[PDB]
Amino acid sequence: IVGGYTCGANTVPYQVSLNSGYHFCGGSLINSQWVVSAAHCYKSGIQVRLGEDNINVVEGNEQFISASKSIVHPSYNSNTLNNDIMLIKLKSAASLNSRVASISLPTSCASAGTQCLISGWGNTKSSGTSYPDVLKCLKAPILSDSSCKSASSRIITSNMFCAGYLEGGKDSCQGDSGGPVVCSGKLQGIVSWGSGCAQKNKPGVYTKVCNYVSWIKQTIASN
Ligand SMILES: COC(=O)[C@H](Cc1cccc(C(=N)N)c1)NC(=O)CNS(=O)(=O)c1ccc(C)cc1
Ligand SMILES: [Ca+2]
Numbered sequence: 001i002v003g004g005y006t007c008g009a010n011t012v013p014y015q016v017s018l019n020s021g022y023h024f025c026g027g028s029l030i031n032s033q034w035v036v037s038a039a040h041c042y043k044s045g046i047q048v049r050l051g052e053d054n055i056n057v058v059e060g061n062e063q064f065i066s067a068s069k070s071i072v073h074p075s076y077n078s079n080t081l082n083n084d085i086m087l088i089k090l091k092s093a094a095s096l097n098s099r100v101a102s103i104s105l106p107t108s109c110a111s112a113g114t115q116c117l118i119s120g121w122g123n124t125k126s127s128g129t130s131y132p133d134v135l136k137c138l139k140a141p142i143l144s145d146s147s148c149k150s151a152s153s154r155i156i157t158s159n160m161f162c163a164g165y166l167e168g169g170k171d172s173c174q175g176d177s178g179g180p181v182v183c184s185g186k187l188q189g190i191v192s193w194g195s196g197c198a199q200k201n202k203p204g205v206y207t208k209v210c211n212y213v214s215w216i217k218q219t220i221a222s223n
Contacts, residue, residue, distance in 0.1 A: 001118065001136035002126050002198040003170035009053040010061060012119045012135060014103035014187075015180060017049040018088075019064075026120045026179030028187055029102045032093040034220055035067075037178035038190050038207065039076040039086040046070065048090060051100045054133045055121055061099040065090045071219060073212070082157045084192045084207045086178075087219055105217075106186040109210035112144045116163055116183035118204075120191065122175030126168070126198040131175060138172065140164045142183065143203060151201045154193075159211055161189060164203035172204045173197035181206050 016027040016035055025041035027048070035048055051061035068091040073083040094100055110116070118138045124130050140163045148162035156162070163181060164171050172179065172191045181189030189206035196202060 001120050001122055001138050001176055002124055002173050004136045004138035007119060007135045007137035009059070010051065010099040012117070012137065013099055013101040015052070015119050015135060017052050017055055017121060018178065019047045019049050020045055023055050023121055023175070025175070025177045026191065027088065028180040029094065029100070030105060030187065030216070031102050031220070032096055033090045035088040035090065036187070036190065036216065037086050037088060038084045038192055039072045040078065040081060040084055040192070041178040042070060042072050042086055046088065048088065050094055053135055056133045063094050063100060065092055065094060067091065069223065071223070073215070080155055080157070081193050082159055085190055085209070085212055087216065089223060103180065103182060103187045104185065105213050106188055106210045109208065110142055110183040110188040112142050114142050114183045116140055116142060116181050116188060118163070118172050118176070118179065118181050118191065120172060120176030120179040122177070123173040123197065126196070138170060140170065148203055151203060152205065153195055156205065159208050160192065160205050161208050162203045162205055163189065166201055166203060168198045168200040168202070171198035
């Protein structure tokens with residue numbers, strides 16, 4: 001997260017860290033046994049870490065649970081990042097409490113101009129590298145498709161939306177992938193991609209979760 005602020009320990013209870021010996025992506029707890037993340041974060045031997053703030057210090061509220069199954073969207077295209085969403089099932093159900101809680105799926109798509117909360121342990125510099133140990137937060141509005149279908153160099157399908165600032169300076173970044181974008185109290189997006197970080201006229205692109213609710217519900221009901 002570039003240009004954000006320190007969230008504060010466990011203030012984003014649904015945020016998860018995907019660990020394969022080190023933190024490599026974020027995710028969101030949607031219920032006691034399922035996590036939603038980005039398909040491009042797929043990897044074998046994933047351990048889900050809940051109740052995290054400082055990912056390098058055991059603080060007492062963590063829950064480490066291995067993944068038993070990973071399901072990448074059936075139409076994921078790794079070249080265009082279309083349908084960049086994946087479901088991860090935990091080997092055992094997490095214990096939900098004040099510091100570990102699920103985030104609700106949307107019933108309608110968020111409107112342009114709506115302010116959202118993006119969080120993650122990703123790079124905090126637009127130029128160079130510096131990874132934080134504690135969770136960072138960013139307030140960012142959803143931009144009109146017009147505002148980036150002309151700003152984005154790659155293809156922006158109807159399964160993505162842009163959020164951020166055209167002036168640059170504030171944006172999600174490497175290591176934030178798979179993380180949540182929450183607007184109106186529901187999970188509206190997944191950190192997917194962008195051109196560099198916090199670059200002018202290059203806002204972040206996010207997976208539009210509202211278009212995947214049917215698939216998510218059907219999958220979790222049968223797995
Ligand atoms: C990979 O290194 C990076 O600095 C960022 C990471 C990132 C991830 C998720 C969201 C954002 C964001 N800005 N909101 C940034 N991505 C890039 O810079 C990728 N752009 S790219 O133009 O470098 C590119 C595009 C396609 C391929 C195969 C490889 C590289
Ligand atoms: Ca910790």
